[PDB]
Design a protein around this ligand. Structure first.
Ligand SMILES: OC[C@H]1O[C@H](O)[C@@H](O)[C@@H](O)[C@@H]1O
Ligand SMILES: OC[C@H]1O[C@H](O)[C@@H](O)[C@@H](O)[C@@H]1O
Ligand SMILES: OC[C@H]1O[C@H](O)[C@@H](O)[C@@H](O)[C@@H]1O
Lengths: 121, 121
């Protein structure tokens, strides 16, 4: 199943493939914007972009979802916060004391689903 | 440890936060560009950007590395290829029959290392 491997030396400043997040939101999440790439539809309103610093990652996250994503907010290991953006429907689920590695999902006119890959601490 | 959790419904078309890849390479890799975000220096020659289709993932990847990332190639589940780009020093390692979830790492003037997160099948 899920794993990871490292290749190379020890120099450099760290980076993540997950470098920035923005959303379009109304009552739902219309779309998530990952590293500037638009995923979803064009309804709702565009949030400001949250950009991860070096060594910074999502450590806590709350997601309201039904058959779509309703609301997202998160906190990073350096105490910065994004959201809540979205509406009040759906049921809330929370990831606590994690390191988020990736956000995949599924989208149409709205953000239907999010498949969050993370380290649980 | 590593895990993942899905939120939301069952509609829409799938997407990945790992949505495009380019490299800058000479005798090794000067940089990797993930979703248009530049990780590393500006030396070497800039490969074309490989952009993943919906539902497309790296299913096979070969990396040559020493103190630095020296070469990258990969193949996707839709039968498309990327690379090899880079030189032929270092030691080769292959991720075979996988689904790549995320590419993190460390870079400076050059691409020092990659942390590849994936599912092994
Ligand atoms: O988020 C779903 C939906 O919410 C509201 O009704 C409006 O802001 C729409 O633009 C948006 O599409
Ligand atoms: O995104 C909401 C809805 O939008 C479109 O109509 C299609 O992609 C559906 O499959 C999806 O569920
Ligand atoms: O990639 C290693 C190195 O190879 C060559 O000497 C040039 O293309 C450099 O710009 C590059 O950094």
């Amino acid at each position: 199943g899920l794993t990871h491997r490292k290749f190379g030396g020890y120099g450099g400043s760290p980076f993540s493939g997950l470098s920035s997040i923005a959303v379009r939101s109304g009552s739902y999440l219309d779309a998530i914007i990952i590293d500037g790439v638009h995923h979803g539809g064009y309804g709702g309103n565009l949030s400001p972009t949250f950009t991860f610093g070096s060594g910074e990652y999502i450590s806590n996250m709350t997601i309201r979802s039904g058959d779509y994503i309703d609301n997202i907010s998160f906190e990073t290991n350096m105490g910065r916060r994004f959201g809540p953006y979205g509406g009040y429907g759906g049921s809330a689920n929370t990831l606590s004391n994690v390191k988020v590695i990736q956000i995949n999902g599924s989208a149409g006119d709205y953000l239907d689903s999010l498949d969050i890959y993370y380290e649980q601490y």
